[PDB]
Design a binder for this molecule. Structure first.
Ligand SMILES: Cc1cc2nc3c(=O)[nH]c(=O)nc-3n(C[C@H](O)[C@H](O)[C@H](O)COP(=O)(O)O)c2cc1C
Ligand code: SF4
Ligand code: SF4
Ligand code: SF4
Ligand code: SF4
Ligand code: SF4
Ligand code: FES
Ligand code: FES
Lengths: 438, 214, 205, 42, 61, 156, 683, 54, 104
């Protein structure tokens, strides 16, 4: 462990030599001949033959955190599975749904740099003891599914993965699984139960995926982004990846900014960047200027909202954002200006959580539909002000009382909307009361 | 409109058969070789999709054939195919236009796109056009949001939709002509427009910044 | 505040606590356990052999002038080794308070009568003789007071049935009101109103 | 909005009766005690 | 209609020894239908539902 | 008890203890009851009529037809009733014949374990043996009236 | 191993480390509320009622499936625990329909009691006025169940019961989210010999007993403990009697015998006590018709026929007879000079003297610990279904591998059929077959033999062969010999001393014959001579009563107190919950009154003196609920093929006379045949 | 009865459960149209106290 | 009701308290009119029996107005009262209490 401290005051733009996804935009070849020229699949045999403990210690020195929204460090997850297992095979499982709205980054990673994903699968399988890599994909994701299947087949004909992985005598067969369109299948235990052929239906946490996972075997579910930045960590050292961002927030993150933006786009940036500099440098600024900005959602629908006064002096890492009461999560920025009514957007997001709730456990089965009814009344104006704090308690009866964090990820934006825009809801219901009173 | 309880219909019933193609049977035995023996139930997630790649939609004979192949009861395949919304248990058109409605696409005017679709094709969401050519059924998030508004017609992501662009899309599709997918503003997918602010120069390549002792 | 929840009296709690400790200090032989129930009422559980002096103490002490004995209540608990319990409720007008003195009695064990202390018990223990069947020794007049003259058994004992054992009708070949075995025209439909889920977690200890 | 039953449940706030000698023994390790205020009915 | 006066009386007790001594006190012809039920230690945890080469792997959910 | 300390009245006291003093005391309680009736007609607040514990008080018919938990609480209050916590109490009031006391002891179930009713006329009919002795037969008839004693509460 | 200390409700307790929070809570005495945790089913986290707050944790934990560790302080009566319970079940109750006065589970519904305890007082659901609560369609799951799917709370108990214990996977979870419905996807029938327990396992009562449709209420019910007699398991039941009528049969928990589970035949035959009953004594007058007469005239007519018999008297015991009527019948026949008695179901010759030849010597509670069993011509799914539940539990948990001999049967689990020839029954006893090596290598082996092979003569020698293999399979505190009976009177009659051959009384050729609750139809009038006088003592009019020259009405198993002995040998006595109808009386009272009218009375005039006479017979029949361990069990194999009488559900439904009289089993058979004919019409 | 003509009682036996002198006797079964109805609703008017709990 | 409310540790509202107090003193007048009429019949005065039972029948009419039964009201319950008083009971009770002083 023990990642190095940063000791840097201001975090500027990421240099192009520091950008990992060099073919993110798609100006070079996605195939293996372009990827070998771009720096992928280089000295993989040495890193694989150097041992699992060296790769786990390099990840722990690098300070890599989870990119899927949990925020749990990947070094601890990869060191949970270094314990010996008797009679049971070991599995690495890659999550690639991202049904959180605002998120498009790892779709571009799979469609444009798939050999980074395959090399990271081999590196994590060597570091973890896994003998097979399972990659889940959306049913809506088909063109990049065929792209990743063709890249996996090209890696099989190259001999980089397979029975003999780069001449190291390691058996690692990489399979890719096509899953139907479901946001709940992005949860790790639900993706296990989808890989086992059942419904979504997420498992309880008192069994852990390192203990009981896919096919009853020890497994570990990791994101596309963590796996894709793993071989760049292994090749360029953990101190280089720890030289970006603050302590306990180290690394580079692939931010995508959409919404009321002149140029909605995805860029790879150093962590603890200012949000205003992030929009104004890469994305061309908020439409109507910075004074026209109403709110930003920093990480998609799992995270609450940020108003303008908090937005003017906020940083993009985990720790400063959770000091500002909102998780970073998936790091997908949605920008809404002053011409956008916010209640329709939050009602749409609560309806999205109602549609993508699996329906197993009670509070997310029922209270999310309750919140969809209450925000439908809030959009229309039929409610009273005394509903509002009651709606807060509905969130307080869901957050922490569910199997997933989908209940937490639905209780959070209602809490953020109430805490930042309660007088706007009061003005909306006063306008509706004055409308119906005549 | 969507029902989770099946009733007997002339459109879908166990009396109508559904047999796999020999090439599709080779695909069946190639799919079943991935999963370990004794845990082949995990094969039913692509296999039903394979039925959706053969019939165009999912009847109950496909469910019975999957349960016969995997040696499972029919009700497990029923609850798996009922849980997922990608499997259409109702008959659908040839070109399945699925639009987006969730607010990272609604800030860019996806309601205008849905209004244009309902105006031209004459039916609401979840309905089928009478010649079985088009079907509007809104799905919730397409997994890519910076190119909003975004629809999918038969698994191709049509991005950056001005209403005139979707007018051109329907005018091309009604004459059974292929249309170029992706964004329609001349923008290659997921990049800033005009001047590239990132990834402008060439990459360094292998051997750049190698770790010592490797 | 809490408008639904009943607010107790703190000064009455302190006064009854001090008086209960005073009673437990004054009579270490007969007083068995002094408790203070919810609702600010003091219960002095005593030995049976201290049935007559303790009440006399509560009649005659300067800080215990419980001049009125309002009623004596008997509770039949068949699960205990000594079955019946006898509750003396006393009212003090000088200090404006009430006390309960509880004792235990078998089906055959006597109780010494409190008629030398309080004369109201001159009928009250008679009711406890009729309803339960405990003998009160040194009673000036011990007879059945509430039941029939030819009645057999004691009614409010829990071993006795609700509808009794016998019925009465009028008979013309004897020209008399006669006694017959009990047959209801419609039986007493017993309702099972036992709670299957416990509600109070503070009373299982 | 504001109310929960846990702050309004009078049936669960009762307790078993307190043994006063035991309470004094636990908490300990002038005028004489009266049952109440003196009322003159004379 | 019923001619049985004792058919409606259930008397609560803590232990069967107390009820046996009460019936010997009142002279009833007593018998005990069944003794106290012993408790069997059954292990229940969530990991048995998802198992490897075991027949206890659940098919629901 | 039950808001007697927000209303004001007078307590009539006899002197001799005969029938005439008790008759004048009853007429004075009648007039002071008219005074308390005057004060209670003078002031009453606007509000609810019952407590809002729906596990204790039955719910109204509007929340019967609309809400679900009120229907559950109605069903379990009119089949098995509320659960009284186990314990003993004695509450005594001033009935017009005397102190009316209830000694209620409960085992925690749906039914009371034992309820004892203190008859106000029980002690009066007990001391009838000393009070009515050495008197006329007509004097015994008046004495039985002076003690107020309907025998439903005495006989229980 | 070691015991870890956990402080539940600030009370220290030592627990096994595999136990969860709720098991430690039930160990110290506190009952944590639940809707989906059943201790005979798999654990699940979908009702979320059992949330408790443990110390130094950010979120409450589900007590049913979170295993404890050393140093935990669990607070059951905490404020956060009560707030979580109130919020979760407020979410449970936002969409429940207002159906409590038309719901048969009300008065004993879990949701009503858990709203009165650990629930809120008022509904926070404002939206009842506009865009109100959901409603889903009803699915025709079966004719035994009544399904109102609006009341379902998605607790997934029925689906786990189907896929774990019932065996078939017809039930499932369709839909996603708030529109999730717990039912079959198509109009199917869920059929198992165990569907009635689904009504037991539904906590809210979306699934309801359809024979018990709006009949009574649970606070009104007089609950009387009894033992069902239709199956040979001898399952402990409780009978619902209200105002002198039977209402329904419900399970009573005996861990050794049934363990909260009841068959459909044992449960849904409460209608059979109402139909085809016998209420008057009937005598066949010489004009050719059976006419109802008085009791005294019928008794003196049977006495005159007995005096006209003059030494040729025989008696046959049936399947619904208790121990006491069989003892009284044998005492009457032995006092009259007749040494022949009969039982309807046959048995081997010479197996009466030792109990182990006709006893399920391995305990029903011990059969869940078996490692490999062998079925010799039996179908325990229909003959004795709770034994099949024990075998399913041992198949799921103890990895039991099972081989069967006979035709192809479905045992609700995976099994291998060796064949239908009896000669391979020798081969498993010979050691040449591989399953003989499986049974020899197993830690706790067993061999289960159906009684219908012991009805055969040459297969009796098969019995002896299996006994020889038990001498190669003896284990400490484990008897591998097992005989699975069909009726509940055979083991009791063999304990008394009956000759179990039904052809024995026919071969004796009597002049007056006694049929004691016999409705099997094994005896006819063409086998008996023309001067025979068949006397029927049982309660139901059937083929046994159709051939009787004198019909005496008896009481059913819910109308009399009588000892029944099951397959394992546990003698248990029923209780008279309901008075007998008409002039019907108890059967041993009929036999004692017949002994009074004839002239040689039985020495007992009371039931306790009859129990003393049973003590004089055998001391193990006097003690009730206590099973003594039996001793060890003690050869030309015929070429006949092994056959099972009960191979399908429609044969299982009409096994017994009470099941024959009820219209519920006829409705079940009509529904099963209708579903099969619609399947054949569609295919 | 209802304004449609159907009798209002649905045989839920709340009134007999709350009838404190046990005057009401209710026996019920499923009616031929499937509705939950009574087949016996007796009130002992000599056991009634006219209390309005029903 | 005070016994059950002390056992249940619940509190009645102020309006239910005033209704209980008002009807307790109305009930007191009824008991005293009963005592005065009974003592007048026992002594021998036939007339104030009827002269005060006219007012006593007015109060049982008030009881029938508030609860529905003339004598056995079943009105005061654990946890307040069963029903609110109907409108216009104030004027009737006030007119009766104005005339009852002259009747006494
Ligand atoms: C309802 C829900 C949906 C999620 N969906 C995704 C997803 O599609 N992709 C993803 O990478 N993580 C998703 N997550 C986060 C998961 O915890 C996932 O295991 C994550 O990859 C863990 O972080 P890490 O593996 O990068 O350390 C989701 C979480 C929840 C609660
Ligand atoms: S939180 Fe929602 S999505 Fe997760 S298990 Fe519960 S019902 Fe399913
Ligand atoms: S399920 Fe329970 S709470 Fe719901 S209607 Fe039936 S009895 Fe009432
Ligand atoms: S039908 Fe009953 S047992 Fe099945 S899930 Fe619903 S509530 Fe549970
Ligand atoms: S009359 Fe009685 S049984 Fe009928 S609906 Fe009313 S309360 Fe229920
Ligand atoms: S009014 Fe009559 S029938 Fe109704 S509950 Fe009261 S006593 Fe029973
Ligand atoms: S919100 Fe439209 S694709 Fe994500
Ligand atoms: S009992 Fe634990 S979640 Fe259901």
């Amino acid at each position: 462990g023990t990642p190095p401290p940063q000791t840097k005051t201001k975090f500027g733009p990421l240099a192009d030599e520091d950008r990992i996804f060099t073919n993110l935009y798609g100006r070079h070849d996605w195939r293996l001949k372009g990827a070998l020229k771009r720096g992928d699949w280089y000295k993989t045999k040495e890193i694989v033959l150097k041992g699992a403990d060296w790769i786990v210690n390099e990840i722990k020195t690098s300070g890599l955190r989870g990119r899927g929204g949990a925020g749990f460090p990947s070094g601890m997850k990869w060191s949970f599975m270094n314990k010996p297992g008797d009679g049971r095979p070991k599995y690495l499982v890659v999550n690639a749904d991202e049904g959180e709205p605002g998120t498009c980054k790892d779709r571009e990673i799979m469609r444009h740099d798939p050999h980074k994903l395959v090399e990271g699968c081999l590196i994590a399988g060597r570091a973890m003891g896994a003998q097979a890599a399972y990659i889940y994909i959306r049913g809506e994701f088909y063109n990049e599914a065929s792209n990743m299947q063709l890249a996996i087949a090209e890696a099989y004909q190259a001999g980089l993965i397979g029975k003999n992985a780069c001449g190291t005598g390691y058996d690692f067969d990489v399979f890719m699984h096509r899953g139907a369109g479901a946001y709940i299948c992005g949860e790790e235990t639900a993706l296990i139960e989808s890989l086992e052929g059942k419904q979504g239906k997420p498992r309880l946490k008192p069994p852990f995926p390192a203990d009981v996972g896919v096919f009853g075997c020890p497994t570990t579910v990791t994101n596309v982004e963590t796996v894709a930045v793993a071989p760049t960590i292994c090749r360029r050292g953990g101190v280089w990846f720890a030289s970006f961002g603050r302590t306990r927030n180290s690394g580079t993150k692939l931010f995508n900014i959409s919404g009321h933006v002149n140029r909605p786009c995805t860029v790879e940036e150093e962590m603890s960047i200012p949000l205003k500099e992030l929009i104004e440098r890469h994305c061309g600024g908020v439409t109507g200027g910075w004074d026209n900005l109403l709110g930003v959602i920093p990480g998609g629908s799992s995270t609450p909202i940020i108003p303008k006064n908090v937005c003017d002096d906020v940083i993009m890492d985990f720790d400063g954002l959770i000091a500002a009461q909102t998780s970073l999560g998936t790091a997908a920025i949605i920008v809404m200006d002053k011409s956008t009514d916010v209640i329709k957007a939050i009602a749409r997001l609560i309806s999205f959580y109602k549609h993508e709730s699996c329906g197993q456990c009670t509070p997310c089965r029922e209270g999310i539909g309750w919140m969809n009814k209450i925000m439908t009344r809030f959009v229309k104006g039929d409610a009273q002000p005394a509903e509002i704090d009651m709606l807060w308690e509905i969130s307080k009866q869901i957050e922490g009382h569910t199997i997933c964090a989908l209940g937490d990820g639905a209780a959070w934006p209602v809490q953020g909307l109430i805490r930042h825009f309660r007088p706007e809801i009061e003005k909306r219901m006063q306008l509706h009361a004055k409308r119906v009173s005549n | 409109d969507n029902l989770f309880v099946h009733r007997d219909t002339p459109e879908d019933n166990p009396n109508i058969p559904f047999e796999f193609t020999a090439e599709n049977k080779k695909r069946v035995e190639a799919i079943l070789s991935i999963y370990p023996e004794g845990h082949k139930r995990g094969a039913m997630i692509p296999l039903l999709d394979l039925a959706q790649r053969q019939y165009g939609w999912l009847p109950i004979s496909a469910m019975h054939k999957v349960a016969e192949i995997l040696q499972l009861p029919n009700m497990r395949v029923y609850e798996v195919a009922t849980f997922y919304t990608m499997f259409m248990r109702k008959p659908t058109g040839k070109y399945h236009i699925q639009v987006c409605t969730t607010t990272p696409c609604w800030l860019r005017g996806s309601d205008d796109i849905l209004e244009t679709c309902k105006k031209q094709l004459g039916i609401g969401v979840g309905d089928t056009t009478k010649d079985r050519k088009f079907t509007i059924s809104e799905v919730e998030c397409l997994g890519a949001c910076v190119n909003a508004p975004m629809v999918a017609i038969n698994d191709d992501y049509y991005e950056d939709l001005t209403s005139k662009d979707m007018q051109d899309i329907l005018n091309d599709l009604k004459a059974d002509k292929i249309s170029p997918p992706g964004p329609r503003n001349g923008r290659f997918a997921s990049e800033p427009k005009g001047e590239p602010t990132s990834l402008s120069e060439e990459p360094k390549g292998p051997g750049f910044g190698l770790q010592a002792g490797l | 505040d809490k408008p639904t929840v009943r607010q107790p009296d703190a000064v009455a709690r302190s006064h009854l606590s001090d008086f209960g400790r005073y009673v437990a200090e004054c009579l270490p032989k007969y007083v068995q356990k002094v408790q203070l129930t919810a609702g600010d009422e003091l219960e002095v559980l005593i030995a049976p052999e201290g049935v007559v002096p303790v009440l006399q103490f509560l009649k005659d002490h300067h800080q215990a002038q419980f001049t009125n004995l309002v009623d004596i209540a008997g509770v039949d608990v068949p699960c205990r080794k000594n079955r019946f319990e006898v509750v003396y409720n006393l009212l003090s007008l000088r200090y404006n308070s009430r006390i309960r003195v509880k004792t235990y009695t078998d089906e055959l064990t006597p109780l010494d009568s409190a008629c030398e202390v309080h004369k109201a018990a001159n009928w009250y223990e008679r009711e406890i003789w009729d309803m339960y069947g405990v003998f009160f020794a040194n009673h000036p007049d011990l007879r059945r007071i509430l039941t029939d003259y030819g009645f057999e058994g004691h009614p409010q004992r829990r071993d006795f049935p609700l509808s009794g054992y016998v019925e009465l009708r009028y008979d013309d070949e004897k020209k008399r009101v006669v006694c017959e075995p009990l047959e209801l025209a419609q039986e007493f439909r017993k309702f099972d109103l036992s709670a299957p889920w416990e509600q109070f977690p503070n009373f299982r200890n | 909005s504001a109310n929960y039953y846990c702050q309004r449940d009078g049936r669960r706030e009762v307790l078993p009766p307190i043994d006063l000698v035991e309470q004094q023994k636990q908490l300990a390790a002038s005028k004489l005690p009266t049952p109440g205020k003196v009322y003159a009915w004379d | 209609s019923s001619g049985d006066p004792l058919s409606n009386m259930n008397v609560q007790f803590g232990s069967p020894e107390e009820a046996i001594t009460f019936c010997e006190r009142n002279g009833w012809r007593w018998y005990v239908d069944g003794a106290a039920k012993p408790k069997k230690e059954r292990v229940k945890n969530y990991g048995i539902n998802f198992a490897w080469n075991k027949r206890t792997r659940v098919s629901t959910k | 008890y039950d808001a007697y300390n927000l209303v004001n009245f007078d307590v009539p006291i006899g002197t001799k203890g005969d029938c005439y003093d008790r008759y004048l005391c009853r007429v004075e309680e009648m007039r002071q009851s008219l005074r308390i009736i005057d004060q209670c007609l003078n002031q009453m607040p606007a509000g609810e009529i019952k407590t809002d514990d729906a596990k204790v008080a039955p719910p109204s018919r509007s929340e019967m037809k609309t809400s679900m938990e009120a229907l559950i609480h109605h069903f379990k209050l009119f089949t098995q009733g509320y659960q009284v916590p186990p314990g003993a109490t004695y509450t005594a009031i001033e009935a017009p014949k005397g102190e009316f006391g209830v000694y209620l002891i409960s085992d925690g179930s749906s039914r009371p374990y034992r309820c004892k009713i203190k008859a106000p006329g029980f002690a009066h009919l007990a001391a009838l043996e000393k009070i009515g002795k050495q008197h006329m037969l007509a004097d015994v008839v008046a004495i039985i009236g002076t003690l107020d004693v309907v025998f439903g509460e005495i006989d229980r | 191993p070691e015991k870890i200390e956990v402080f539940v409700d600030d009370i220290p307790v030592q627990v096994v480390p595999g136990t969860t929070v709720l098991q430690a809570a039930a160990q110290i005495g506190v009952e944590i509320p639940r809707f989906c945790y059943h201790e005979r089913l798999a654990v699940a986290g979908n009702c979320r009622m059992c949330l408790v707050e443990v110390e130094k944790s950010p979120k409450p934990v589900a007590a049913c499936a979170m295993p404890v560790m050393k140093g935990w302080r669990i607070k059951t009566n905490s404020d956060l625990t009560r707030k979580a319970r109130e919020g979760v079940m407020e979410f449970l109750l936002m969409n429940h329909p207002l159906d409590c006065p038309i719901c048969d589970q009300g008065g004993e519904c879990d949701l009503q009691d858990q709203a009165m305890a650990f629930g809120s007082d008022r509904s926070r659901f404002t939206d009842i006025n506009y865009t109100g609560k959901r409603a889903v369609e009803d699915k025709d799951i079966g004719p035994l169940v009544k399904t109102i799917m609006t009341r379902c709370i998605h607790c997934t108990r029925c689906v786990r019961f189907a896929s774990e214990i019932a065996g078939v996977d017809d039930l499932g979870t369709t839909g996603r989210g708030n529109d999730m419905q717990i039912g079959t996807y198509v109009e199917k029938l869920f059929l198992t010999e165990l569907s009635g327990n689904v009504i037991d396992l539904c906590p809210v009562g979306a699934l309801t007993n359809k024979p018990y449709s709006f009949v009574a209420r649970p606070w009104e019910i007089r609950k009387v403990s009894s033992i069902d007699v239709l199956d040979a398991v001898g399952s402990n039941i409780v009978v619902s009697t209200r105002t002198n009528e039977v209402l329904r049969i419900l399970p009573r928990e005996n861990e050794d015998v049934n363990e909260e589970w009841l068959a459909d035949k044992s449960r849904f035959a409460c209608d059979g006590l109402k139909r085809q009953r016998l209420v008057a004594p009937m005598v066949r007058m010489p004009n050719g018709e059976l006419q109802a007469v008085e009791w005294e005239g019928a008794l003196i007519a049977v006495a005159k026929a007995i005096k006209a018999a003059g030494g040729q008297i025989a008696g046959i015991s049936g399947q619904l007879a208790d121990l006491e009527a069989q003892v009284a019948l044998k005492d009457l026949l032995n006092r009259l000079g007749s040494e022949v008695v009969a039982t309807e179901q046959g048995f081997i010759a010479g197996g009466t003297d030792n109990r182990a030849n006709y006893l399920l010597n391995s305990t029903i509670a011990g059969l869940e610990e078996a490692d490999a069993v062998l079925l010799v011509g039996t179908n325990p799914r229909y003959e004795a279904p709770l034994v099949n539940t024990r075998l399913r539990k041992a198949y799921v948990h103890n990895e039991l591998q099972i081989a069967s001999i006979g035709p192809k049967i479905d045992l609700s689990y995976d099994h291998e059929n060796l064949g239908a020839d009896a000669a391979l029954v020798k081969d498993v006893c010979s050691g040449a077959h591989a399953f003989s090596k499986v049974l020899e290598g197993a830690k706790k082996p067993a061999i289960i033999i159906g009684a219908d092979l012991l009805e055969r003569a040459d297969g009796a020698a098969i019995h002896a062969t299996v006994a020889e293999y038990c001498k190669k399979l003896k284990k400490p505190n484990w008897n591998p010999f097992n005989v699975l009976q069909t009726n509940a009177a055979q083991v009791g009659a063999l304990d008394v001393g009956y000759k179990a051959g039904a052809q024995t009384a026919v071969k004796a050729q009597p002049k007056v014959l006694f049929l004691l609750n016999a409705d099997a139809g094994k005896v006819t009038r063409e086998q008996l001579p023309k001067d025979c006088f068949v006397v029927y003592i049982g309660s139901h009019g059937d083929n046994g009563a159709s051939i009787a020259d004198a019909v005496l009405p008896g009481a059913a198993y819910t109308e009399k107190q009588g000892i029944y002995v099951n397959t394992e040998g546990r003698p248990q006595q029923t209780l008279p919950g309901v008075s007998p109808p008409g002039m019907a009386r108890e059967d041993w009272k009929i036999l004692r009154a017949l002994s009074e009218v004839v002239g040689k009375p039985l020495p007992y005039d009371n039931l306790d003196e009859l129990r003393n006479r049973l003590e004089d017979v055998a001391p193990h029949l006097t003690r009730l609920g206590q099973l003594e361990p039996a001793g060890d069990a003690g050869k030309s194999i015929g070429g006949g093929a092994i056959d099972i009488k009960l191979k399908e559900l429609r044969d299982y439904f009409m096994t017994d006379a009470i099941s024959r009289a009820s219209p519920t089993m006829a409705k079940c058979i009509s529904a099963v045949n209708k579903q099969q004919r619609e399947n054949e019409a569609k295919q | 009865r209802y304004p449609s003509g159907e009798e209002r009682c649905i045989a839920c036996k709340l009134c007999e459960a709350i009838c404190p002198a046990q005057a009401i006797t209710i026996e019920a079964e499923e009616r031929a149209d499937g509705s939950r109805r009574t087949t016996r609703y007796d009130i002992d008017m000599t056991k009634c106290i006219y209390c309005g709990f029903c | 009701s005070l016994a059950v409310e002390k056992l249940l540790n619940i509190d009645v509202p102020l309006r239910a308290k005033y209704i209980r107090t008002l009807f307790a003193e109305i009930t007191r007048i009824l008991n005293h009119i009963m005592a005065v009429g009974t003592h007048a019949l026992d002594v021998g005065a036939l007339t104030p029996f009827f002269w005060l039972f006219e007012e006593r029948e007015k109060m049982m009419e008030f009881y029938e107005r508030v609860s529905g039964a003339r004598m056995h009201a079943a009105y005061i319950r654990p946890g307040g009262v069963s029903l609110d008083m109907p409108l216009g009971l104030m004027d009737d009770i006030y007119e009766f209490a104005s005339k009852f002083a002259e009747r006494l």
